[PDB]
């Protein structure tokens, strides 16, 4: 066996403890991935750090499932019911915001997103996140940093990020 195992890329050492990753099927020194031999006994399926990292990054790129869509609706609704969401519920009315459409080239609001969710417009979570981010970026671009509108965007985006944790 001339294969270089683990993240450290070294030949197999029969005297050292290794744990196998069920995702990539490579073998890792327990110490290099933070797993103790006694600890391995209590582990069922094992996924190494690099594979876990890839899976985490993958979440926003994979196809949205019907279960994912039920989740998107849940997230949207929690945002719509949030106290700081009132400025983003519907498209901005020109009469309420001077030259808004002359400043904002790509408007977005929660009602438009709800419609997109309804017609399954999003194919990846990254697209949903992009529209939501657009709402907050548009607000912070149009409104001054000391206006409550700007602050509502800061609050809601922080709330949104937490809401998305462990989504898929």
């Amino acid at each position: 066996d001339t294969k270089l195992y683990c993240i450290c890329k070294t030949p197999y050492d029969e005297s050292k403890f290794y744990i196998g990753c069920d995702r990539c099927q490579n073998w890792y020194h327990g110490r290099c991935v933070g797993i103790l031999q006694s600890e391995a006994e209590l582990i069922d399926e094992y996924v190494c750090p690099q594979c876990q990292s890839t899976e985490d990054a993958m979440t926003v790129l994979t196809p949205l499932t019907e279960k994912d869509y039920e989740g998107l609706k849940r997230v949207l609704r929690s945002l719509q019911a949030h106290k700081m969401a009132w400025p983003f519920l519907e498209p901005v009315d020109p009469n309420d915001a001077p030259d808004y459409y002359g400043v904002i080239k790509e408007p977005m609001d929660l009602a438009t997103m709800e419609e997109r969710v309804q017609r399954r417009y999003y194919e990846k979570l990254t697209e949903f996140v992009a529209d939501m981010t657009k709402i907050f970026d548009n607000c912070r671009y149009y409104n001054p940093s000391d206006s409550p509108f700007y602050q509502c965007a800061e609050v809601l985006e922080s709330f949104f990020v937490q809401k998305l944790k462990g989504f898929k």
């Binding site: 744990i19 196998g20 073998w27 069922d44 094992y46």
Partner: peptide, 6 residues
């Protein structure tokens, strides 16, 4: 979990 021991 699958492992290799000394």
């Amino acid at each position: 979990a699958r492992t290799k021991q000394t």
